[PDB]
Amino acid sequence: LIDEFNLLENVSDELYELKKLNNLDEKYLISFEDISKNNSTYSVRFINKSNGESVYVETEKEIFSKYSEHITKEISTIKNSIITDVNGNLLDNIQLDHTSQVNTLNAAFFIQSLIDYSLNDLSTSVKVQLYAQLFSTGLNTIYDSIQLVNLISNAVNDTINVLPTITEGIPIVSTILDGINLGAAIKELLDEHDPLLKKELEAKVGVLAINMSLSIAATVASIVGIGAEVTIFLLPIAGISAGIPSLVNNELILHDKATSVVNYFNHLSESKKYGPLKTEDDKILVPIDDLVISEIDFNNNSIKLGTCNILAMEGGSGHTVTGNIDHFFSSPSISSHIPSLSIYSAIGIETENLDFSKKIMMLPNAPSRVFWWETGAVPGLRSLENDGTRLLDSIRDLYPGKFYWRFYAFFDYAITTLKPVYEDTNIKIKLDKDTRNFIMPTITTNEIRNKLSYSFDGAGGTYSLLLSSYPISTNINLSKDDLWIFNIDNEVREISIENGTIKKGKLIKDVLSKIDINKNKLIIGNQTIDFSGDIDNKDRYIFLTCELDDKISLIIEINLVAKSYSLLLSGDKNYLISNLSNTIEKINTLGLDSKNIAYNYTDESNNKYFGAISKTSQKSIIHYKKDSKNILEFYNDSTLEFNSKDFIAEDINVFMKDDINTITGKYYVDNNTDKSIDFSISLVSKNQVKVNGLYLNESVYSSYLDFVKNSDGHHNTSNFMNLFLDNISFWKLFGFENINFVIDKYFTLVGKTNLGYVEFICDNNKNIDIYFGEWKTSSSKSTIFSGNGRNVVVEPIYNTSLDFSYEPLYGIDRYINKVLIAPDLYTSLININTNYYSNEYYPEIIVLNPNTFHKKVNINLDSSSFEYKWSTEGSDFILVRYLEESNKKILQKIRIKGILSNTQSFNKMSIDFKDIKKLSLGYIMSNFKSFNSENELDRDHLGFKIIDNKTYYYDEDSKLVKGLININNSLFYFDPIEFNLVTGWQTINGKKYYFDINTGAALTSYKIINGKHFYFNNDGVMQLGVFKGPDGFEYFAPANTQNNNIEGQAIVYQSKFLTLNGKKYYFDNNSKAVTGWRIINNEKYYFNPNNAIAAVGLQVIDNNKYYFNPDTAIISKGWQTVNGSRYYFDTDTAIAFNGYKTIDGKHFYFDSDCVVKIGVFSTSNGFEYFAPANTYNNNIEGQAIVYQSKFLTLNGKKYYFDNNSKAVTGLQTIDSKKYYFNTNTAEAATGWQTIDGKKYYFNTNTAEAATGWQTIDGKKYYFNTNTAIASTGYTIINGKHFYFNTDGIMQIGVFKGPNGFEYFAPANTDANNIEGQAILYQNEFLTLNGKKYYFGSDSKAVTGWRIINNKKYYFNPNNAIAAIHLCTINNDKYYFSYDGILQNGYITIERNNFYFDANNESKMVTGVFKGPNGFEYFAPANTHNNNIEGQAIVYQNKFLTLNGKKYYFDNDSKAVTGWQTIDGKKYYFNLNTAEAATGWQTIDGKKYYFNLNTAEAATGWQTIDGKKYYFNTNTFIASTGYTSINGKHFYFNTDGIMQIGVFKGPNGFEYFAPANTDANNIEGQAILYQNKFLTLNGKKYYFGSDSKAVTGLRTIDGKKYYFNTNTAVAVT
């Protein structure tokens, strides 16, 4: 030890110089593990303690690398003695191998000394090195700057025990499981509840401690309570009342037609009536669907609304308002560039002083929004009155001239389309200290959902949140003491939306596979919760919960900061156990990996149940109280293994390591409140319990030591420990007096003295010895480790002398090796107290010579000099006090080591005795008597040694083993006073063993001892009673029983009965007990082949159940009653009847346990009533009795019996009432049955079929008074007509009878009509919840086309129902107003414009027509970009020829009307139909002519089929009469036809001639024609010099003529 004391100062000196030489501060730490050598130069790492940065310094001196392999070799030894740390708690790995024990002690004792200083710089480097190794991956591998600074901080600023011990002083019961020292750790977790401890104990070593804290109890209760409330609701998804946007053309459209839009506003006006929150189910407040709530303030009892606006209007002219119908001249137009209009400001939504008394609330589902809209031409709407139209009006009126939703310009328009544009909404929820339950909405259009955001402000209460299947970003600001519950039922179950309502379904595989847990972010499946606020609170637990069953709830327990989660199940105890197999598999399906589950449940009657379940093997421990008794139930997988109905322990704790259970507590021995033993117990089998530790308080250990000291040398093997448990009556802890208490390796007993405590432990040999012990007197500290022999070492404690006494050694003296007294420099007194004569062994005392000597050294013995005798052994002085005058012989040996080696130290010694003082070693040698210590068997040999023809065994520490001990799985005995191997017969405290006369081993099983027969168990103890050998079962009996036998020898017993204190045996002729079946005195007996005892009570010998009389042990036959159940055993063969059977004229039934049945059961013989006793005649119990033509009510079901006492099945009439008995059970039916199409109802308390009119819990039915059958279809009930649907429900509406549709009207609608009875309704409308009918003369509803008050309608001839909106009836589309009234013209449908020609019964048609924006080409389908049928299409700058007409269309795709010239041609288009004009046309006075094919205005000369006209090139008018063109003159008819002949112009009659008449003239040109006759058309003319025709009387070439002065024609 001084060898290292020099080495340390050697290596810290050089370390000191190496530091100054590279100018290294006291803040730099050498790092011995990483030193490299490369070609004669060592490179040595130094870590800067402050910032964790590294520096490497070169050296030549090899002391550092040399001393590093010294010390790292010893730290490894220590690191292998420790399993891990759980939150800084180091968990020891207990080693029972003696060389492991002795190696880790030396390493521990070494390193623990270097740490323990105040030079310190080399010391704190060793401590840091060790720390970085036990708690981390080794200093040599850490290179993170921060991680190192924190490691090194922890290493210096705390303190680590690394010396072997188990309790380490703590006065508790130690649990060593799988070789790990868990006991101390689990106490702290249960004491102060560290989140970090709890997590690492579960993760690193598999430990689940369970917490019966009444707080946690309450919490789990309130969580499961919340889950039982919130999950039961059938709520709808978001928007089934407001609407769900459609995505047409990449923008979203909430509503698309006028009526729908008006109705959405109608919906919103419910905020007026019901405030922001309707209370559906009297249990939960629900926000008005799509109402934008942007803050909910629970302190203020107030709401904040978000923004919900609609676009503005601007402009317009001539606003008149007549009959609340806005009329215009210039219609306004919507603008997105003017401020938009708040819809809610028109609504008086009261948003303050709200009744937040209900605890469950659905969150808002509406982000803010600005509504874009559109106007359209829709007819009929002028008579519309809703709370919808009333709201829209209010918006109009709140914001005059900026919003008009239904007006008139030159056609009546209206709001047509509602396009929302959503903006991110953040909804703050400001909580109170109260308790609040929140349900997230299921929002289906993604575009809406990703604008919503929840933000909670915690305030100390309990808050739940029901996650939806489709996530919404939520954020929780944590307060200090608030409790957050997340029920994840929808996130962890397959979801389904059936008619838009949310039903939960299957459990979804592997959802909880990954749970990302982070200081401020949890990820459960698809949902992400973000946390802010008090997010470093190490103590908070957040809870995840869900419902696995009707009655079983799962709670996932999450610590955000310790990034860890744990499992826990709550529910009825007896239920969970019955379904433990099944509800575990649900956990695995979730993909939860946790290997242990805690049980924590509180019933309706307020009794707490606690427990823990191993997932992997389904072993469970349950603890609870009942009538103040302590209950413990251990279940193996739903079947009950161990059950203690009164556990007599205080301070109970329960925990699980992997699948091992441990229960610890205090037990008061003999119920003395002053005698507390502390226990650690693992339940294993029904009648077997494992003890893995006992801590004895001061009183019990002293009683225990007494028991050890009177062990008779039976103080060593594990079975010795069983005999202690016996002596202290420990079975009383449980109640069962024969429990197998299992004492096995790693068992610890640790008792407490008034000076310290000793720790004992079990070997790999199943032997018990001192492991560690320590006690302190006022002045001197006595220590003992199994790893250094089992020597007691006496050292001084500070706060000058060394006291020693034999008294602390009382009882444990057996196990002690030697007492080594070890003085230091500063001890000049060693007091030795020899006058103590109560022990059985007095270990040699060795005074260890201080190697460094001391100024003086003085021993003080309190005995008299004459009792002593000195001796010399080498350089050792010896004193021996021999007390022989008593009856026991005490021999106290004292040896001063090596004091003969130093002639100086030898004369320093003074011993002083009781009667003589200040004596010297010299004096004692010169005057005391001497002796010669020749201890041949105080050798140093390990094993079986053999000395002076006697055999000794030497144990692990090379001591001499004494007593009854296990060696090499064999049992031996060494004399308690002489220690040699004993052979042959030994008594050990009442109980006789026997050890082989050749090998020493105690006898096992059955052997022959010098002519006798002897039976020793596996512990070797001699047994009394009956036991089996290779000749049979003998009776190894007490002494003096049959011819003065010695104990346990098989004796003679033949053909006689033996009853060994409560049993029965029979011995045959050959004196060997009898087994099998055996007939004795003509009477049957069964003796078990395993132990030769007579069976008593019910028994099963080879799948055959017999009853043996409990007193006489003989068979019993016939009827019998055992434990209040009747049985039948065969009168011949005694086998017990099971199944159907017959017995001397009676039917009987017995279920699988051969117990009589009672009731109605089906056999191959019928359905028979196996009846109770004294029911009919004095019938036997269970006898099928005659029950003739009667009804049987079996306190339960109902049966009818026919004449041969058998139950009836099927449909059966009995005494005018109909019944329906089950085919398989024979029992009456109840409720709805359908017996071959026919549907019945059987009254649940009498089973009779219902007859007549009936109200069955919600609706009305009629059951035919003769056949009990439900009514279906049109149906007559005593002359009055009624209607009933497919399931027979009476309907109230309009339905098809054989005489048309009839108003099956409610009660009191015409002259006290009965509800549901058809009535008279003559010449009137009927508007019945949306559907609208008209009833004609006969008060039968009219179908088909029909006009009333000059408004045509159309009632669907399949339901009598008026038509609304666009409709297809007989291949033609019509448009009906909101009230069924047919309309015509320009109607806008879904943002397109169509035409419904009023000249075609208003059929929608394709053509060119006038809409209030122009003439538009209502094209057929697929004419421009896959357009719709009859939709106005774009058609720009093109002509169009259609069905033999011709139009032309301008830039704005609208026809053109009137006089038009289009790219070099003139056209005229009908002011009334935009049709091209074709053919002869008198237009606005002038007469024109347009081409028949191309409708072009004709210009110039044209021949219109038979006649030539000339149309003026300037004005396109057909010219008439004397018309000069191109100089030349022509003459045309009144109707524009060219003429050829003589005609009058301004200058007179000219000749308008054929072509080439004169001077190559063109046809019809007036020509020169001089002094010539011209005779055409029979008429004769003369032309003069002026080429003009002549009138009057004239004289032409001799002849006279008279020419008509009117026509210039010759009339002569």
Residue numbers in the entry: 857 to 974, 980 to 1660, 1669 to 2481
What does the paper say about this structure?
Two homologous exotoxins, toxin A (TcdA) and B (TcdB), are the key virulence factors of C. difficile, leading to C. difficile infections (CDI) with variable clinical features including life-threatening pseudomembranous colitis. Most of these toxins are composed of four structural modules: an N-terminal glucosyltransferase domain (GTD), followed by a cysteine protease domain (CPD), a delivery and receptor-binding domain (DRBD), and a large C-terminal combined repetitive oligopeptides domain (CROPs). Triggered by acidification in the endosomes, the hydrophobic pore-forming region of the toxin undergoes membrane insertion and facilitates the translocation of the GTD and the CPD into the cytosol. The GTD then glucosylates and inactivates the Rho and/or Ras families of small guanosine triphosphatases (GTPases) in host cells, resulting in depolymerization of the actin cytoskeleton, cell rounding, and ultimately cell death.
Here, we report a 3.18-Å resolution crystal structure of a TcdA fragment composed of DRBD and CROPs I–V (residues L843-T2481, referred to as DRBD-5CROPs), which serves as the foundation for us to piece together all the known fragment structures of TcdA into a complete structure of TcdA holotoxin. The crystal structure of DRBD-5CROPs was solved by molecular replacement (see the Materials and Methods section), and a near complete structure including residues 855–2,481 was built except for a small flexible region including residues 1,661–1,667 that had no visible electron density. The structure of DRBD-5CROPs starts with an N-terminal small globular subdomain (SGS, residues 850–1,025) that is part of the DRBD but with a largely unknown function. Notably, a hydrophobic region buried in the SGS (residues 958–1,039) is considered to be the N-terminal portion of the pore-forming region (PFR, residues 958–1,130) on TcdA, and the rest of PFR then extends away from the SGS forming four α-helices (PFR-α1 to α4, residues 1,040–1,130) that stretch across the elongated DRBD. The N-terminus of the CROPs is connected via a hinge region (residues 1,789–1,831) to the proximal tip of the DRBD where the SGS is localized. The CROPs I to IV then forms an arch-like structure pointing to the distal tip of the DRBD, where the first and second SRs and LR4 of CROPs IV interact with the DRBD. The rest of the CROPs IV-V kinks by ∼35° and extends further away from the DRBD. We found that a well-defined β-hairpin in the SGS of DRBD-5CROPs (residues 937–953) directly interacts with PFR-α1 and α2. We envision that the β-hairpin in the SGS in the closed form of TcdA can help to stabilize PFR-α1 and α2 in the DRBD-shielded conformation at neutral pH. Interestingly, we found that three residues in PFR-α4 (D1117, K1118, and T1120) interact with H2234, T2247, and E2259 in the CROPs IV via van del Waals interactions, suggesting that the CROPs can help stabilize the pore-forming region at interface II in the closed conformation.
